[PDB]
Amino acid sequence: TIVNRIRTDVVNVAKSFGAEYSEAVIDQIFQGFGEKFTNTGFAIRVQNKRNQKVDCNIRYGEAKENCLAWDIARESGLLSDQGHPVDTLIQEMFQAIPAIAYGADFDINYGLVKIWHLPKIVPVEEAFKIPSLPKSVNAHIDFFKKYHLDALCALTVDYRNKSTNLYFDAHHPEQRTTQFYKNILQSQQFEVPSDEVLEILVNCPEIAVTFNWSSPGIERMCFYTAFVNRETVPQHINPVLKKFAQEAPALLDNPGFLVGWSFGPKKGTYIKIDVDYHGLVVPSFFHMHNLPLP
Ligand SMILES: CC(C)=CCSP(=O)(O)OP(=O)(O)O
């Protein structure tokens, strides 16, 4: 079955990258969501957020107007009350802005970590009316305006990290220059990457910004770039990129990949890479950002 193949592939990735994981957590996740994994926009992610340790996450999205993952997770015990603003945030998001899709992310050593809301691209002001957003979001209105973050294309709630991300369609001509990325990173006193990386970032169609309830500033930002096959991933930049691009499992022999380049002060600077397990994620990514499939 597809669900058994997926579970085996997930465990094999965790073993190969040395990622921490719990068999009991994987059982809980698949009891709730394994069927969803078989026929939606499913991806396996690895990231090198920690020193000499790779973490493994699995995630999916699907085109429903309602947040099915929240109900499944609550009924399943994967999402308990946190005693925290996150407890109502996703519900407020779905009340404030109509969604065309939703998704959910799981850490295989922990359980459910994120749920996201996918609207049609909307003006970022539509988000400011959400009651339980961190105060730092509304406090960054001028920052958003200055860096052409006006086209909101997703929102995420991170229940484990107690943070929220706003996602922007990086449509503006200034976002096609390397100086834009140097400027936005320097505005936060974040680490500026090499020229090679900057030349990859100028093609980013999606920019995420992370906010939390413990600081007035941006926690980290992330630049997303997609690659249509294993070979066009920039494997030479980091050994996790090379190993995952060459060895990640999928239902197709040569799948596409989504790479997230994260930057922070703390740490917050690392790479994330997701395999398009069924082949739906990467075309969907280009289509939602009004770009042709390269
Ligand atoms: C890609 C967007 C639309 C939802 C996925 S959640 P993410 O991987 O961007 O979240 P992190 O900030 O990396 O934890």
Domain boundaries, the chain: 64-103+114-288
Residue 272 CB less than 6 A away from ligand 1: yes
With beta carbons less than 8 A apart as the criterion, state whether 128 and 192 touch: no
Q: How was this structure determined?
A: X-ray
Amino acid at 138: N
Tokens found for residue 184: 């936005």
Helical residues (DSSP H) of 147-289, grouped into ranges: 178-187, 195-201, 239-247, 281-288
Which tokens sit at 262? 């994260």
Binding site per annotation, positions for dimethylallyl diphosphate:
45, 59, 114, 165, 167, 220, 224, 272
Contact status, residue 138 vs residue 128, Cβ threshold 8 Å: yes
Q: Ligand 1 centre and the CA of 154: distance in Å? A: 9
The closest-lying atom of ligand 1 relative to the alpha carbon of residue 220 is 12
Q: Is the CB of 116 under 6 A from ligand 1?
A: yes
Going from the Cα of 156 to the center of ligand 1, the distance in angstroms, rounded, reads 7
Report the relative pairing of strands 206-212 and 163-169 from DSSP bridges: antiparallel
> What letter would DSSP give residue 8?
H
Cα–Cα distance, 134 to 94 (Å, whole number): 17
Ligand 1 nearest atom to the CA of residue 208, by list position: 9
